[PDB]
Amino acid sequence: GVCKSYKSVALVVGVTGIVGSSLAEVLKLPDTPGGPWKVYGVARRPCPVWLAKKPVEYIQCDVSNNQETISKLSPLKDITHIFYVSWIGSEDCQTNATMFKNILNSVIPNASNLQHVCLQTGIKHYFGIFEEGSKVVPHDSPFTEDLPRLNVPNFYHDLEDILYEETGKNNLTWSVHRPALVFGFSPCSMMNIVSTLCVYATICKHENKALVYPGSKNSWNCYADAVDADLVAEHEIWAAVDPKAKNQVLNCNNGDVFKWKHIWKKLAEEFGIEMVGYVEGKEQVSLAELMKDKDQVWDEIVKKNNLVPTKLKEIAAFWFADIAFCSENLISSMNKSKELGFLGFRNSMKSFVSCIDKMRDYRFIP
Amino acid sequence: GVCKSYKSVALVVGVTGIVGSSLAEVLKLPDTPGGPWKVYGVARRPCPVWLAKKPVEYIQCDVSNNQETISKLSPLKDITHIFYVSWIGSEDCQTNATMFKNILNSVIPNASNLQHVCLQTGIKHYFGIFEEGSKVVPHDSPFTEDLPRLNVPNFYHDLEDILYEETGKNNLTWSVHRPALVFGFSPCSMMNIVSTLCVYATICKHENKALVYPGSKNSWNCYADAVDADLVAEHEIWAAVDPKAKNQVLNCNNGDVFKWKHIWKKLAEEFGIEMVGYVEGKEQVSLAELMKDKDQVWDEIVKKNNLVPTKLKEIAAFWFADIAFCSENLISSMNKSKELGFLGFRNSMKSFVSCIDKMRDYRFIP
Ligand SMILES: NC(=O)c1ccc[n+]([C@@H]2O[C@H](COP(=O)([O-])OP(=O)(O)OC[C@H]3O[C@@H](n4cnc5c(N)ncnc54)[C@H](OP(=O)(O)O)[C@@H]3O)[C@@H](O)[C@H]2O)c1
Ligand SMILES: NC(=O)c1ccc[n+]([C@@H]2O[C@H](COP(=O)([O-])OP(=O)(O)OC[C@H]3O[C@@H](n4cnc5c(N)ncnc54)[C@H](OP(=O)(O)O)[C@@H]3O)[C@@H](O)[C@H]2O)c1
Ligand SMILES: CC(C)=CCC/C(C)=C/C(=O)O
Ligand SMILES: CC(C)=CCC/C(C)=C/C(=O)O
């Protein structure tokens, strides 16, 4: 059979991630802008079974290693768009920078039809980094894309600088996407809040305990926002294909606000267990501490429910929930994207439930 | 010349109001859905000069008087859509009810091509009434259209009940629109926040004083939302013409959030004066009290700047600003409208400035 024709050819760097996994789905839909798409999906681990069941050409590669990346990506002469949706899982500026440089150095000399590089960062651009030593004054919100860089060693700054330099030199377009908190389904993410809260809820249910909210008062009652992984995918694809979005920094959220108070009630209902909400006068407790000895319990759950086998620390990031539940005042604006013609949105309450439903369909959670 | 053809014929009840004045503009644009529109505009006062310069057939009528309303509206046999965007200016349930009943009793028997009645209420549906005696527990937010009625004598309840009964009996469709705080330009409104704050700012400037924020701490820092009058008009016209919107209760806001803190800075810049923002530890002061003796000052301003002559209490509602500046937790959801296909929005910061610009173009403010 003659070689298959594609209109566009994506390199998704971080294909097992919370957005990369969505891109692997969304890019292959028949009506997706820029389609038909061929998808190369890059990650460090062996292709998981769930991803092997998708029409994605998986490339196992440690992108922090330059010679390996050259060897693995330089043969991919047909790439048209790069979606960089990866990070090393620490805030180390140079390791993260090296990963992104390696992608560009390996692809740009070899992909003569390369058009665009999508760089995914996030709303930490506006408020700072997670490293405990960093005592920094964030910007006030709503966050908009005209806010200047904070005086902090945020690896996002280095990634942008590389993006601008390398696209500029090579007559490529660029986009920087700054998603809010992601609502997604990947069990291989280092920061999946829905999966994390679903695992907590599952363990509570397993142990005949209530779904006890461990967070701060402020994070219970404040306005919060998030972004569905599929909407991030759609926003990145929009910037990759639509001339109006090119060479722009762009926030990405669902377009609404919610409260954790309301999400919590929904979570309890979804698992058919009692909730204990925020109790007046109580201080936040560490969910990471509450769950520190639960690995064997999770193993037992996986076995009893015949789930996709996951290690507790890989499917859940309890430390990340702890940060979410002592955060407030982090709302980001979608006006710039809307004014440029991107009218994609989600109902965040419905998005949260859709992620639960999807994780159950995939057998990641009971 | 042969009688002019129109596709649709609007009765706008409250044509001098903050939304009615926008409808008088929007309905007459060439690309407005349902057009070409003929517009009958009803209000109690004599047609102001600014409205006489619009292609609107003005009908001076006190709609609280049944015989007068019959006499004035029963000849209008060609009405296709009613936009009820009026209230008496008190919370008296029966006077407000009487006004709306009178419209329907006068039009329904006489307009054989009548299709739809749009009823404008508002987000007070979710939190209660302004009357000082009423000590009531509001719903929590974000406000959605599935929230049940509060146990309060809100005239909105009576207006809805009349709408349902009379449309139901007569095979007409209905829509209830619940706008957030309106950003608009009418100088004849009983509740125009932008005009009110512009008048304050103008007086501050006239007296070489700073723009001193008089509100509460909470209302300075909280998330707030609003709706541009033109977007309310567009939302009402959408419900009047689009089958998907028919027989629905629908919120209407700009689709974003803002803070008064940020609006205040913008207001000061627009008037080229210094601002004093919220001062930590200060209690809210009454802007109504601050402005109680300023009528002659406003007269002098009107004369010195050659403005459209307005009485201070008619262009500004300082009591209404006082309520805005002790409110929080009033965000409403636009998901229902979006899910039904209405994707109209405004950038609220830009909307606020556009209202200032428009009021200056009309010579209502300097
Ligand atoms: N998650 C959120 O809620 C969120 C919100 C806003 C912004 N963001 C930002 O979005 C960006 C991407 O993060 P994410 O959360 O989408 O990531 P994630 O879900 O944790 O996924 C990371 C991906 O990168 C891959 N990866 C990591 N190190 C690699 C290496 N050395 N070589 C090759 N692949 C490697 C991972 O595969 P392996 O496991 O095989 O290494 C995985 O596919 C980050 O800047 C993050 O801060 C995230
Ligand atoms: N303003 C806001 O920010 C806001 C926000 C959300 C919801 N709403 C709601 O929207 C609804 C309409 O209020 P609005 O603020 O748009 O009104 P508005 O700007 O004060 O305008 C009221 C209109 O009704 C007319 N009117 C009053 N009494 C009348 C009578 N007896 N006969 C005939 N016309 C009469 C007025 O004309 P005359 O002066 O000549 O009488 C004027 O045209 C109310 O339920 C209000 O609570 C308002
Ligand atoms: C409330 C929380 C936990 C926000 C952080 C979202 C992320 C992960 C942003 C980013 O990585 O830029
Ligand atoms: C923050 C304020 C002042 C909200 C009231 C908006 C209005 C006027 C609602 C309604 O009339 O339903």
In chain B, what is the greatest distance between 2 CA atoms, to the nearest angstrom? 69
Task: State how far Cα A164 lies from the chain centre.
Answer: 22
Q: Which of A142, A331, A338 sits opposite B345 (nearest CB)?
A: A338
This structure's resolution (angstroms)? 1.8
Q: Which residues neighbour A135 within 8 Å (Cβ) at sequence distance 6 or greater? A: none
Reported as half-sphere exposure (CB side, CA atoms, 13 A), residue B84 has a value of 30
Cis preceding-peptide flag for B179 (omega within 30 of 0): no
CA–CA separation, B321 vs B286, rounded Å?
Answer: 9
Hey, what amino acid is at B356? I
Phi-psi region of A329 (alpha: psi -120 to 50; beta: other; left: phi over 0): left
- Ligand 1 close to Cβ of residue A211 (< 6 A): no
Q: Ligand 3 atom closest to Cα of A327? A: 1
- Select from A70, A65, A76, A94 the least CA-distant residue to A12: A76
What is chain A's Cα-based Rg? 20
Q: A1-366: which CATH topology?
A: Rossmann fold (3.40.50)
Q: Which residues are registered as beta bridge partners of A227?
A: A182
- Ligand 2 close to Cβ of residue B334 (< 6 A): no
Crossing angle between the packed helical segments A348-361 and A193-206, to the nearest 10 degrees: 60
* CB neighbours of residue A256 within 10 Å: 25
Reported as half-sphere exposure (CB side, CA atoms, 13 A), residue A108 has a value of 19
How many degrees, rounded to 5, is the angle at CA A57 between CA A51 and CA A61? Answer: 85
CA–CA separation, B163 vs B185, rounded Å?
Answer: 28
* Structure tokens given for B277: 């923002």
Contact A256 B339 (CB under 8 A): no
Collapsing DSSP to helix, strand or coil, B153 comes out as coil
CA–CA separation, B91 vs B114, rounded Å?
Answer: 29
Contact B142 A334 (CB under 8 A): no
Q: Give how far B345 is from chain A: nearest CA, Å.
A: 9
What is chain B's Cα-based Rg? 20
Q: Ligand 4 atom closest to Cα of B180? A: 6
Alpha carbon nearest to ligand 1 atom 7, residue: A122
Residues of A in contact with B256 (CB under 8 A): 142, 333-335
- Ligand 4 close to Cβ of residue B176 (< 6 A): no
Q: Find out whether B272 and B360 touch, Cβ atoms under 8 Å.
A: no
Q: Which residues neighbour A278 within 8 Å (Cβ) at sequence distance 6 or greater? A: A213, A215, A217, A220, A221, A261
What is the helix (H) or strand (E) element at residue B127, kind and residue range? helix B124-127
Q: Are strands A8-13 and A37-43 parallel, antiparallel or unpaired?
A: parallel
Reported as half-sphere exposure (CB side, CA atoms, 13 A), residue A31 has a value of 0
Q: Find out whether A201 and A271 touch, Cβ atoms under 8 Å.
A: yes
A279 CA distance to ligand 2 middle (Å): 43
CA–CA separation, B203 vs B211, rounded Å?
Answer: 9
Collapsing DSSP to helix, strand or coil, A252 comes out as strand
Q: Which residues are registered as beta bridge partners of B12?
A: B41, B83
Give the C-alpha distances (Å, rounded to integers) separating A167 from A174, A247, B16, B202, B309: 7, 10, 55, 50, 58
* CB neighbours of residue B110 within 10 Å: 16
Which residue in chain B has the smallest CA separation from A330? B223
Ligand closest to A66 (CA) is: 1
CA–CA separation, A252 vs B230, rounded Å?
Answer: 26
CA–CA separation, B357 vs A318, rounded Å?
Answer: 50
Q: Could you give the residue numbers annotated as active site of A?
A: 124, 156
Hey, what amino acid is at A327? S
Contact B345 A333 (CB under 8 A): no
Contacts 24+ apart (CB under 8 A), B75-78: B75/B110, B76/B9, B76/B11, B76/B40, B76/B107, B76/B110, B76/B111, B77/B110, B77/B111, B77/B112, B78/B6, B78/B9, B78/B38, B78/B111, B78/B113
B258 in reach of chain A (CB within 8 A):
yes
Residue from A12, A18, A351, A352 to probe ligand 1 pocket by mutation (most atoms less than 8 Å from CB): A18
CA–CA separation, B138 vs A285, rounded Å?
Answer: 30
* Structure tokens given for B156: 């909105």
Residues of B in contact with A338 (CB under 8 A): 255, 345, 347
Q: Which residues neighbour A168 within 8 Å (Cβ) at sequence distance 6 or greater? A: none
How many degrees, rounded to 5, is the angle at CA A251 between CA A330 and CA A55? Answer: 120
Q: Which residues neighbour B291 within 8 Å (Cβ) at sequence distance 6 or greater? A: B200, B203, B312, B316, B318
* Structure tokens given for A189: 């993410």
DSSP 8-state class, residue B147: P
A276 in reach of chain B (CB within 8 A):
no
CA–CA separation, A124 vs A160, rounded Å?
Answer: 14
B215 in reach of chain A (CB within 8 A):
no
DSSP 8-state class, residue A18: T
Q: Find out whether B267 and B211 touch, Cβ atoms under 8 Å.
A: yes
Give me the residue spans of the domains in chain B: 1-366
A129 CA distance to ligand 3 middle (Å): 9
CA–CA separation, B155 vs B168, rounded Å?
Answer: 20
* Structure tokens given for A85: 């949706």
Contact B335 A256 (CB under 8 A): yes
Residue from B191, B332, B348 to probe ligand 4 pocket by mutation (most atoms less than 8 Å from CB): B191
Q: After which residues is chain A broken (C to N over 2.5 A)?
A: none
CA–CA separation, B117 vs B160, rounded Å?
Answer: 11
Tally C-beta pairs within 8 A across A and B: 36
A164 in reach of chain B (CB within 8 A):
no
Cis preceding-peptide flag for B148 (omega within 30 of 0): no
A145 in reach of chain B (CB within 8 A):
no
* CB neighbours of residue B113 within 10 Å: 11
Q: Find out whether A251 and A334 touch, Cβ atoms under 8 Å.
A: yes
- Select from A319, A364, A199 the least CA-distant residue to A271: A199
CA–CA separation, B335 vs B255, rounded Å?
Answer: 9
* Structure tokens given for B215: 């509100």
Q: Find out whether A14 and A84 touch, Cβ atoms under 8 Å.
A: yes
CA–CA separation, A153 vs A95, rounded Å?
Answer: 13
Q: Find out whether B44 and B61 touch, Cβ atoms under 8 Å.
A: yes
Collapsing DSSP to helix, strand or coil, B174 comes out as strand
